[PDB]
Inverse folding.
């Protein structure tokens, strides 16, 4: 169950290897828009949070 | 121009890094790899321009 738009559910992710591929296990989404980065090279960098 | 100037474009991502003073007139779609893409598709088959 997702929350409302004003009470948008925020989750912090740290201290774990992030597999950016499991994000494409289903695929009808029309808005997979990445800003400032490329959706392909996401596995070629690392971030703090 | 107000919401215009579409004659000037660029490439945010490419299949490979360009060589020094290398020019590429074609604008084909980058292959996705994990899913067969001939026309429009998802992960990596977006338009580069």
């Amino acid at each position: 169950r997702f929350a409302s738009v004003y009470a948008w559910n925020r989750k912090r992710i740290s201290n774990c290897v992030a597999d950016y591929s499991v994000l494409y296990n289903f695929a009808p989404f029309f808005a997979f828009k990445c800003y400032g980065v490329s959706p392909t090279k996401l596995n070629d960098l690392c971030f703090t949070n | 121009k107000v919401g215009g100037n579409y004659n000037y474009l660029y490439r945010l991502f490419r299949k490979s890094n360009l060589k020094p003073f290398e020019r590429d007139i074609s604008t084909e779609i980058y292959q996705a790899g994990n899913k067969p893409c001939n026309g429009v598709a998802g992960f990596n088959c977006y338009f580069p321009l």
Remarks:
- Chain B touches chain A through nine residues (CB under 8 Å).
